[PDB]
Design a binder for this molecule. Structure first.
Ligand SMILES: [Zn+2]
Length: 139
């Protein structure tokens, strides 16, 4: 109901006040992103959320902070992620400046999804991905 929705917004705002990079869109950098790619634990603007939608459900799961209800598991993805952790991971593999169709289909981005998922489920992470495999795209 209304209470569960309001507590979720309060949670997101805490994460935006904790890690300031959550207050800029992950892909384009504009301030006050009101959308989330849950699967990546990142914050996006309305336009970049549209780009993510065209990537398909295997790549990105998109939610609006203003308009959508969030499941408790979905909020955990954001709690264990954030813009900073994803950006650092993508930068480390040299793929952070790739356009979305390439960036989110890299082994590096796919590997980050698996890492975040494992943190959410409190299980062992996948083996570290070799740097030279990171730029290659998944099938
Ligand atoms: Zn954007």
């Amino acid at each position: 109901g209304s209470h569960m929705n309001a507590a979720a917004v309060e949670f997101i705002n805490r994460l935006k006040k904790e890690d300031e990079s959550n207050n800029k869109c992950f892909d384009c950098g504009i301030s006050n992103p009101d959308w989330v790619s849950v699967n990546h634990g990142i914050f996006l603007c309305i336009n970049c959320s549209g780009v993510h939608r065209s990537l398909g459900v295997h790549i990105s799961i998109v939610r609006s902070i203003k308009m959508d209800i969030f499941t408790d598991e979905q909020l955990k993805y954001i709690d264990k992620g954030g813009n900073k952790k994803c950006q650092t991971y993508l930068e480390n593999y040299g793929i952070s400046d790739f356009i979305p169709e390439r960036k989110y289909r890299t082994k590096a981005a796919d590997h980050y999804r698996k890492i975040l998922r494992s943190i959410v489920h409190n299980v062992d992470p996948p083996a570290p991905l070799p740097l030279d495999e990171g730029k290659s795209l998944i099938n």
